[PDB]
Write a protein that binds this ligand. Structure first.
Ligand code: HEM
Ligand code: NAG
Ligand code: CA
Ligand code: CA
Length: 343
């Protein structure tokens, strides 16, 4: 199908998403940047999608419908759930685009998380399928993990939601590579999970492995533990998945291994996007998503930030020694904050 703009797609229904694409690249991602709104849109996919529970269906029935746009349709209800803190603003921003283009909330959330990732260097080539009907009921609370849940709790939650195993839990957490936290530390917003929040790379996995030495802002916040780097926040679930015997070697496997990071996250992100859906009833519009850019310099893919070395690593994978990475030159730095979006 040749769209009105001359670009070819498989299904002509996909042609409409080019207009959506142009509208959000300009009016929501500020010219296709991998910054706050891109990060917020990647996060939204997870909070929409994971709220599904076959377990619950079998007992206290409606476990939620997954990737159905419910968090936007019933936003007053769902974004008030404490694990969904801060998403009322993200939904408020996305909602006008859904309303004017007449696309379903589910497909837009899926579209905007794929586009947001195509804006981050190093991102996999992202997929996009359309076909999610609007939710008719809000997800129950209790389905989105908290940063203070136990490793056993998260493994069980993810397993229930879509039969993901604990290796796949580590893969989807790759998204904290292009991410900041606005709401855990009440004194500062935009503290990144890693030193490169606009780059999809394995620095999240290198840096959560350092011994925790400092709080970036205040201490005593529920769900936060020390990081080993100034300006960087570390949440407790990420801290302990890095060290736990079930996930420690998978955590570490990403260090210095870009192709594994990318191929695993391409896969797992599409799977989140299809929770509660039948893939065989969806239309592939991956042709609309723009090509992801390479990570631009000529550096090592993974490294130790200035002032860190192998001595700072808390070796948790017993089978494989932590790789020998270069330490970048210079004294220790402070990772800069990404201010959250206006409104
Ligand atoms: C065990 C599950 C997870 C936990 C406990 C967790 C927890 C968190 C927390 C506490 C924040 C900050 C929220 C705030 O301050 O408002 C955060 C941010 C984020 N998370 Fe997760 N997360 C998990 C899984 C995921 C997954 C699987 C993805 C999606 C593919 C994801 C993507 C993000 C992104 C991109 C952000 C940054 C949002 C922004 O910059 O505005 N998270 N996560
Ligand atoms: C990256 O991971 C893949 C999949 O486990 C593995 O086959 C490959 O050898 C790893 N690459 C490096 C550079 O170790
Ligand atoms: Ca949902
Ligand atoms: Ca990163």
């Amino acid at each position: 199908a040749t769209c009105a703009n001359g670009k070819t797609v498989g299904d002509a229904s996909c042609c409409a998403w080019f207009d959506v694409l142009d509208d959000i690249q300009a009016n929501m991602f500020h010219g296709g940047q991998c910054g706050a709104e891109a990060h917020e849109s990647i996060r939204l996919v997870f909070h929409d999608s994971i709220a599904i529970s076959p377990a619950m269906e079998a007992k206290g029935k409606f476990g939620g419908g997954g990737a159905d746009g419910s968090i936007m349709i019933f936003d007053t209800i769902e974004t008030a759930f404490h694990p969904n803190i801060g998403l009322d603003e993200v939904v408020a921003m996305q909602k006008p685009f859904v309303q004017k283009h007449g696309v379903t909330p589910g497909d837009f959330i899926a579209f905007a998380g794929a586009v947001a990732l195509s804006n981050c260097p190093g991102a996999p080539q992202m997929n996009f399928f359309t076909g999610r009907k609007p939710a008719t009921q809000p997800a129950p609370d209790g389905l989105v993990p908290e940063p203070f849940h136990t490793v056993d709790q998260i493994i069980a939650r993810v397993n229930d939601a879509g039969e993901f195993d604990e290796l796949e839990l580590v893969w989807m957490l790759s998204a904290h590579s292009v991410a900041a936290v606005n709401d855990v530390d009440p004194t500062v917003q935009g503290l990144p999970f890693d030193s490169t929040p606009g780059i999809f790379d394995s620095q999240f996995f290198v840096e959560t492995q350092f011994r925790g030495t400092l709080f970036p802002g205040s201490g005593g916040n529920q769900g936060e533990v020390e990081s080993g780097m100034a300006g960087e926040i570390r949440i407790q679930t990420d801290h302990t998945l890095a060290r736990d015997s079930r996930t420690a070697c998978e955590w570490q496997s990403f260090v210095g291994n870009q192709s594994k990071l990318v191929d695993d996250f391409q896969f797992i992100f599409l799977a989140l996007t299809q929770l509660g859906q039948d893939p065989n009833a969806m239309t592939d519009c991956s042709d609309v998503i723009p090509l992801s850019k390479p990570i631009p310099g000529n550096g090592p893919f993974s490294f130790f930030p200035p002032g860190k070395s192998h001595s700072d690593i808390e070796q948790a994978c017993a089978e494989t020694p932590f790789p020998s990475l270069v330490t970048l030159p210079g004294p220790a730095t402070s990772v800069a904050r990404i201010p959250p979006h206006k409104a």
